[PDB]
Design a protein around this ligand. Structure first.
Ligand SMILES: [Mg+2]
Ligand SMILES: [Zn+2]
Ligand SMILES: [Zn+2]
Ligand SMILES: [Zn+2]
Lengths: 49, 257, 477, 64, 192, 48, 44, 115, 98, 35, 40, 240
């Protein structure tokens, strides 16, 4: 439902340095499947105590 | 209406390459000679491999592929050797093939390089050219490669392994007097090693009456034949192609009438 | 900020965002936040100094690593939310250097702008000289190229595996490729590619391949198909076992030859197989015993590479059989460069037929000039020009995207030093006639890839085949 | 995986130059200098050794 | 068959030499782009100083964007025509365009002179960040560089920001192609 | 259409339903032609 | 009917009926030995 | 699966004629020579030798298909000269030239090897 | 004993943890293999990262079709407890109603 | 003292090389599972 | 200004709908207002 | 239930009547062939040797069809089956004994597809008439379908991995239908826009532009070479 409200296929400005701007499957999955940029890191989480 | 009277001036003759110039010839004859160098000069190459044991990291037809590409000395034996198809034997015999054997077992901690030096032939005339040696496969301790192969006659038109040349440099009109190539900017183009122009000059003046002549060759040999032997074989091979065609043409003309 | 940079109480992955206008400070510690390392800039200067670089140069035998840069407060991770409050410099040498004061409050700097690209886009050479969709197409094609997918591929038994005989590392490469190990496990070969209209067989994204080069192993590859079969004793009445069926023992057996099978019902390694052959002989006892042996597809024709016999997770005896099939490049096989220039092989010419330079060099691949103008893959032309300088110079060319030290003019000047036209054009002679071609052909080394899509895997015909019993309509048999 | 026997473009022998090429590099030769020492003049043959990856070495790290 | 065999003599290629232009042509393109940027700066100053009067049927923002876009659109055309005139009779980009075989005038200009303005949904690159297209610009930066105007050609290469904005503009083409494939034959099967 | 000083002849709408209920089916036939032609010829394409 | 152990590479003759397992290693992954039949390769 | 044997390009199968002559009815004194299992090596050399004949009005060759191994040589001669006669004289001249080239290349090899 | 957890290869709980490249080759493992996947019935399975909206954050959106002029949602989740996320909406009813 | 522009290209890729010496390319998957 | 075109507009015509996406008119003036901007 | 069997996109009425798999169809990758006519499609030997056309035995072709039966499946071109006047099918490869393989008028010999056979060639999506045109089969020695470069435009086909379907009409009546209605030359001009649907393309279009320039001059030898590729040439060399 969330994806319907706003189109996520478009390459958003904020993907810079986080998601590769070029790599995306062609076809029905354009812009929906993404790939991390080389130095992109996803936080594993920690306690805010 | 009749044949050209071509002349030959050999400029360099080593064990690897022969550089020569042919003059007073047509471009078609000059080109057909260089195509025969590559595609129609017979040599001897391995075209049959049975692998009795292969524990190496390369599969069987990887090894066979590498064996076929190993050049074998075929300078004088090739002429008297027969084609297996033409030979009447039971698919193989000394008159149409040369047997090879390779039996290498690695029993040492040091990696064993299976080279062409390990290829052993029953004919002393036909041996691997290198005997640095050509690497066939590297063997780890406990790995073995046991095979027997047959080397038969063939020319490069069938497979690139029977091509005796390691590069055929062909050239004509180095100064572009004929304007067979039009340079958008002649000044940007380096001079040919055969060029006879001054440093300031970039192109020879256009020769409207000129014809392609004085063709330059540099036939580099892989090792199977001597570079001079390739050219001599090519001229006789091309001559045999035409004489065969003439013989067939004569019968066809007779049948028509 | 100070605590995070000292790593005292605040871990590196904690993002603190201040919305000055909204009077809100948002601190995020949860997981799932995507962040990247950025160099910290203070007073229009990098906190990264020569001393940090020197210590990193002796990375080993020094215990100095990336973590010391983070601990030293020289680099920190910035997530997307924090990036909205960050004034970022693309480079230190240009952005925060004294100049017209566009901005004097840079807070961070990029380590290198080329890190925006991912794994597959990081092998594209000169991706900033290509039209963007072509970089997207290559990222797709790069995942379908052939090479050595993993070093221990002999031990593995995968349903499908393609291995190139002679993978090469690109002559022209990107700095990022050092970390993808693309050098260690390359997927492709450096091809002498001529951009010419030779005989019309490279038209409409088709390719003319050198038959002599193919004869020498050019883009030769292996195809491994692994078949797994397990025998299940479920059901008291039925008990399937591995053994070659015999006419007298089994009531019904196909006319296919079972000589290939061993006494254990499994074909031995090193045996040619085809459609008519049976690789696994499995017979199920009737409630004589019916046979349920496995057959190969008519298309496949290879040699049994490996036969392993084990007990699966369920504890049932099962065997994996790997069939080896060598795939020599032929007409219809797809080939691609690293710039979205994908095409099938239209025809193959022997070395004598191919056009040749004055040195006797014939291109391995000839591509149509009409592929470039629409796609605007100038990076393909620059890669060929750089690769020509690389092969002659003996140095691997650098095609990092946003490099000001490299440009076509600099590459062209280098090519002149080696006795070649500065723009990579050469005078080619017609292979058929030997006459000089009036136009000088752009020729040089380009990294090409063989794609998994072979024509043999695709060609298929149907002519009065095995219809379905229920529907009385065609079906695969 | 292993050095090709022939240069793809011209068929020149290259299979007996990988070990010498590695030896020359160990002798502080530049890659271009080593190729010139080995007789590789055409850039098609220089391509063969300059771009070769010798995976057979690591394949031998797995016991048969 | 007849001309495929004459082309064996004439030959046809394309290479780096066809993507280059004269140093004089490069200077002319640079002057046009340098002046075009200054023109956009002046339009920004008028808007900033409230000296920009909206045109009928458009708000102030639409008026500014229209004025900026025409300046940059004119600059691309001026540089594109200049690059085309520099081409010689021998140029292979021109030969394929002139015959109509492949490519167009815009392709030549992009390769040689300027890639041009990148648009998402018909507008310049949006302020996806907070009043910024990228974190590398100042807030409320309406200049050509900030909003997705590629001042370089494909031969010269794009800067990291231009590379990303060009990727943003190129993603729109990728999405549209996928939609058309989905829509392909839908109307036909309804009409039939 | 009824508004004064407004051409009651050339004035039209791009809504087929509005045309149908105001002018008729034959007006729709002509209006549908023009709408269908306009979309087809927008990009310069031609259909018989 | 020789099977090579995947762990110790021991060649052991195994019948169809008896369980598949290394005689001395105890390993449960067995590879068939290469066929004694001769297969011809053309070095093409 | 459809790959043809490499020898099919130069080996005649049973019942295949190396050369066949067909009269070209469009123009007088014209014949078509269909040579099997030949390529540009013999087509170009023969065709160029024919053009040196002043009695040969037209000489050309072609490979109808690269995947096939036939060359068609069309020769039109003057009324007093036969296309078959032109073809035979063309081959003899080529054989004469090639024989002369062999002799002179052999002499050159001796000269260079001698010193 | 309560069950078995599939283990991601080359992770701290994988057998190939801390093994040197030579050790990996002894185990017939490619040192260049990055790990990061699971072997499930012999199949190497990779878990694709799933992109979802951040929790505990107030987001104000506008829907034209719906009956609310604006809606400020907040998907609330505990600090690593009660995986289910409860979403609360605070919507301002549209002015369309007359 | 300070990294000059003539040394920046070498310096920045030493920083990048050290980053991949420590993290690799699938550190996200492994770190997530370890947690 | 902008109006629906291409497939979506083609879809609307064949899919005749009481509410098009971008309903609009084209009013023509038959008096002096046609040639007089102020009167228009 | 019975209602389920009919319902759905895969139901009998829709999934088995409006569209269905068909015999005597082939599909493979397409590659260029400038040496073929526009109305000619190159076909792999394996595809041709697998697909057959039933030829009614007549005294005109009694001997020719007899040879194909003798050659059989082993040798191409041969035949796969014999259908007697009874309508019963005989599998040739099982038993090649000529005694049981005598032919007579009224027999149908399912000979292998040969050169000149009419086929329907299709690229999907099939958007207009020119997406299913008729071609003459040309057996060629590799594993791809060949297309003249001009017919790529009507098919919207490219040689970068595209695959096209080959359908072989199986009777004289349907074979004559393709010849007189659906062959490529009859499709040159489309009624959609009353203009040609295929034209000259990349190399030939770029080269014909150069070829027709005012300063293109051809020597005697060159002209005789170009005339060898002019099938309609009347044999007279024009005055230079
Ligand atoms: Mg395609
Ligand atoms: Zn013999
Ligand atoms: Zn070479
Ligand atoms: Zn054991």
């Amino acid at each position: 439902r969330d994806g319907k409200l706003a189109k996520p296929r478009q390459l958003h400005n904020t993907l810079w340095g986080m998601v590769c701007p070029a790599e995306t499957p062609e076809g029905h999955a354009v812009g929906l499947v993404k790939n991390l940029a080389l130095m992109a890191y996803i936080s594993v989480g920690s306690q805010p105590s | 209406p009749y044949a050209n009277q071509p002349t030959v001036r050999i400029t360099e003759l080593t064990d690897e390459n022969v550089k020569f110039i042919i003059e007073n010839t047509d471009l078609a004859v000059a080109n057909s000679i260089r195509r025969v160098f590559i595609a129609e000069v017979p040599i001897i190459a391995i075209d049959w491999v049975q692998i009795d044991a292969n524990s190496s990291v390369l599969h069987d037809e990887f090894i066979a592929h590498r064996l076929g590409l190993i050049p074998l000395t075929s300078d004088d034996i090739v002429d008297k050797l027969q084609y297996s198809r033409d030979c009447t034997c039971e698919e193989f015999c000394p008159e149409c093939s040369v047997e090879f054997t390779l039996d290498v077992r690695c029993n040492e901690d040091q990696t064993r390089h299976v080279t062409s030096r390990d290829l052993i032939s029953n004919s002393p005339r036909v041996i691997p050219v290198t005997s640095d040696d050509i690497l066939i496969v590297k063997l780890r301790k406990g790995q073995e490669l046991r095979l027997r192969a047959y080397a038969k006659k063939g020319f490069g038109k069938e497979h690139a392994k029977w091509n005796p040349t390691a590069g055929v440099a062909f050239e004509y009109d180095p100064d572009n007097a004929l304007r067979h190539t039009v340079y958008p900017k002649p000044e940007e183009w380096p001079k040919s090693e055969y060029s006879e122009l001054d440093e300031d000059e970039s192109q020879a003046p256009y020769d409207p009456n000129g014809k392609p002549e004085r063709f330059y060759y540099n036939v580099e040999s892989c090792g199977s034949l001597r570079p001079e032997t390739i050219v001599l074989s090519a001229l006789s091979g091309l001559k045999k192609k035409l004489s065969d065609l003439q013989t067939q043409l004569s019968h066809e003309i007779q049948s028509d009438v | 900020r100070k605590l995070r940079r000292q790593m005292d109480i605040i871990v590196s992955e904690v993002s603190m965002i201040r919305d000055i206008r909204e009077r809100e400070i948002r601190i995020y510690t949860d997981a799932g936040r995507i962040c990247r390392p950025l160099l910290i800039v203070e007073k229009q200067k990098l906190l990264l100094k020569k001393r940090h670089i020197d210590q990193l140069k002796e990375r080993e035998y020094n215990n100095y690593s990336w973590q010391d840069l983070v601990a030293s407060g020289v680099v920190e991770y910035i997530d997307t939310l924090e990036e909205e409050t960050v004034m970022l410099a693309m480079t230190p040498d240009d952005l925060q250097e004294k100049e017209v004061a566009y901005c004097s409050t840079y807070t961070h700097c990029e380590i290198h702008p080329s890190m925006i690209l991912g794994v597959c886009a990081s092998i594209i050479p000169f991706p900033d000289h290509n039209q963007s969709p072509r970089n997207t197409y290559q990222s797709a094609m790069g995942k379908q190229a052939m090479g050595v997918y993993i070093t221990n591929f002999h031990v593995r038994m995968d349903t499908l595996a393609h291995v190139l005989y002679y993978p090469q590392k690109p002559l022209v490469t990107t700095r990022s490729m050092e970390y993808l190990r693309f050098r260690e496990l390359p997927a492709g070969i450096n091809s002498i590619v001529a951009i010419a209209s030779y005989t019309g067989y490279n038209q409409e994204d088709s390719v003319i391949m050198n038959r002599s080069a193919v004869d020498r192993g050019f883009f030769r590859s292996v195809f491994y198909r692994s078949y797994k079969e397990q025998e299940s004793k479920k059901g008291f009445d039925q008990e399937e076992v591995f053994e070659k069926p015999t006419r007298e023992t089994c009531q019904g057996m196909r006319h296919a030859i079972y000589d290939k099978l061993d006494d254990d019902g499994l074909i031995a390694p090193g045996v040619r197989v085809s459609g008519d052959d049976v690789i696994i002989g499995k017979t199920v006892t009737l409630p004589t015993k019916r046979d349920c042996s496995t057959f190969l597809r008519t298309s496949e024709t290879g040699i049994v590479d490996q036969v392993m016999v084990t007990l699966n997770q369920e504890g049932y005896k099962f065997c994996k059989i790997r069939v080896r099939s060598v795939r020599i490049p032929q007409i219809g096989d797809k080939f691609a460069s690293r710039h979205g220039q994908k095409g099938t092989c239209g025809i193959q010419y022997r070395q004598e037929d191919m056009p040749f330079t004055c040195e006797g060099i014939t291109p391995d691949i000839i591509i149509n000039p009409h592929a470039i103008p629409s796609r605007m893959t100038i990076g393909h032309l620059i890669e060929c020009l750089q690769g020509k300088v690389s092969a002659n110079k003996g140095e691997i060319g650098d095609a990092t995207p946003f490099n000001d030290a490299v440009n076509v003019q600099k590459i062209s000047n280098l090519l002149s030093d080696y006795g070649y036209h500065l723009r990579g054009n050469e005078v080619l002679y017609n292979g058929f006639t030997g006459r000089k071609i009036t136009s000088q052909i752009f020729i040089g080394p380009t990294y090409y890839q063989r794609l998994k899509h072979m024509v043999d895997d695709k060609i298929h015909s149907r002519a009065r085949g095995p219809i379905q019993i229920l529907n009385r309509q065609p079906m695969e048999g | 995986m292993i050095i090709p026997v022939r240069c793809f473009t011209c068929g020149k022998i290259v299979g007996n130059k990988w070990e010498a090429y590695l030896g020359l590099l160990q002798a502080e030769y530049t890659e271009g200098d080593a190729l010139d020492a080995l007789g590789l003049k055409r850039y098609c043959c220089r391509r063969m050794l300059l771009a070769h990856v010798d995976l057979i070495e690591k394949l031998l790290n797995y016991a048969p | 068959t007849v001309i495929n065999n004459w082309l064996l003599i004439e030959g046809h290629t394309i290479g780096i030499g066809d993507s280059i232009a004269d140093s004089k042509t490069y200077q002319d393109i640079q002057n046009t782009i340098k002046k075009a940027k200054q023109d956009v700066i002046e339009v920004i100053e008028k808007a900033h100083n409230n000296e920009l009067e909206p045109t009928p049927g458009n708000t102030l923002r639409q008026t500014f964007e229209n004025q900026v876009n025409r300046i940059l659109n004119d600059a691309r055309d001026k540089t594109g025509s200049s690059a085309q005139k520099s081409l010689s009779e021998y140029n292979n980009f021109k030969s394929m365009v002139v015959s109509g075989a492949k490519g167009s005038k815009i392709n030549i200009s992009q390769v040689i002179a300027v890639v041009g303005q990148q648009n998402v949904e018909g507008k310049r690159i949006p302020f996806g960040f907070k009043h910024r297209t990228l974190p590398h610009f100042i807030k409320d930066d309406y200049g050509p560089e900030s909003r997705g105007f590629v001042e370089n050609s494909y031969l010269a290469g794009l800067t990291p920001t231009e590379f990303f904005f060009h990727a943003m503009g190129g993603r729109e083409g990728l999405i549209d192609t996928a939609v058309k494939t989905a829509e392909t034959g839908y109307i036909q099967r309804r009409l039939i | 259409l009824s508004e004064k000083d407004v051409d009651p002849v050339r004035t039209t709408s791009n809504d087929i339903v509005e045309i149908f209920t105001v002018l008729g089916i034959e007006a729709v036939r002509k209006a549908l032609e023009r709408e269908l032609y306009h979309v087809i010829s927008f990009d310069g394409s031609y259909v018989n | 009917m020789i099977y090579i152990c995947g762990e110790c590479h021991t060649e052991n003759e195994i019948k169809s009926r008896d369980p598949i397992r290394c005689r001395e290693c105890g390993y449960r992954i067995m590879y068939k030995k290469r066929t004694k039949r001769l297969v011809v390769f053309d070095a093409r | 699966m459809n790959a043809p044997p490499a020898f099919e390009s130069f080996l005649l199968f049973e019942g295949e004629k190396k050369i066949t002559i067909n009269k070209d009815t469009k123009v007088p004194n014209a014949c078509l020579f269909t040579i099997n299992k030949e390529d540009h090596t013999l087509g170009n050399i023969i065709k160029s030798q024919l053009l040196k004949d002043p009695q040969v009005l037209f000489a050309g060759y072609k490979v109808p298909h690269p995947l096939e191994h036939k060359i068609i040589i069309r020769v039109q001669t003057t009324p007093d000269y036969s296309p078959q006669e032109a073809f035979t004289n063309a081959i003899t001249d080529l054989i004469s030239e090639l024989s002369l080239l062999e002799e002179r290349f052999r002499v050159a090899i001796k000269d260079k090897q001698e010193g | 004993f309560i069950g078995k957890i599939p283990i991601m290869l080359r992770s701290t709980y994988c057998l190939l943890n801390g093994l040197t490249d030579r050790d990996l080759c002894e185990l017939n493992e490619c040192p260049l293999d990055p790990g990061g996947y699971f072997i499930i019935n012999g199949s190497e399975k990779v878990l694709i990262a799933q992109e979802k909206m951040a929790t505990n954050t107030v987001y104000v959106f506008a829907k034209k079709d719906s009956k609310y002029a604006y809606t400020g949602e907040c998907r609330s989740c505990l600090e690593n407890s009660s995986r289910p996320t409860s979403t609360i909406w605070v919507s301002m009813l549209a002015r369309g109603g007359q | 003292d300070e990294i000059t522009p003539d040394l920046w290209q070498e310096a920045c890729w030493i920083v990048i090389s050290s980053y991949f010496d420590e993290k690799g390319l699938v550190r996200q998957q492994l770190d997530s599972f370890d947690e | 200004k902008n109006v629906t075109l291409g497939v979506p507009r083609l879809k609307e015509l064949i899919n005749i709908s009481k509410k098009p996406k971008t309903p609009s008119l084209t009013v023509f003036l038959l008096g002096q207002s046609a040639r007089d901007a102020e009167r228009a | 239930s019975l209602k389920q069997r009919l319902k759905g996109k895969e139901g009998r009425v829709r999934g088995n009547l409006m569209g269905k798999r068909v015999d005597f169809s082939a599909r493979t990758v397409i590659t260029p062939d400038p040496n073929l006519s526009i109305d000619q499609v190159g076909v792999p030997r394996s595809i041709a040797a697998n697909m057959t056309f039933a030829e009614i035995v007549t005294p005109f072709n009694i001997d020719r069809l007899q040879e194909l039966v003798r050659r059989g499946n082993s040798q191409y071109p041969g035949a796969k089956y014999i259908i007697r006047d009874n309508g019963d099918r005989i599998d040739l490869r099982f038993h090649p004994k000529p005694s049981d393989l005598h032919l007579q008028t009224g027999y149908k010999v399912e000979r292998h597809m040969c050169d000149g056979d009419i086929v329907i060639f299709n690229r999907q999506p099939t958007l207009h008439k020119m997406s299913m045109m008729g071609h003459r089969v040309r057996i060629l020695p590799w594993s791809t379908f060949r297309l003249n470069l001009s017919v790529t435009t009507p098919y919207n086909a490219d040689f970068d991995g595209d695959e096209m379907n080959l359908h072989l009409p199986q009777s004289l009546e349907t074979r004559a239908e393709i010849q007189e209605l659906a062959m490529v030359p009859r499709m040159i001009v489309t009624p959609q826009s009353n203009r040609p649907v295929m034209g000259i393309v990349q190399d030939t279009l770029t080269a014909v532009r150069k070829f027709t320039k005012r300063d293109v001059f051809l020597e005697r030898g060159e002209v005789m070479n170009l005339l060898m590729f002019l099938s309609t040439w009347d044999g007279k060399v024009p005055q230079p």
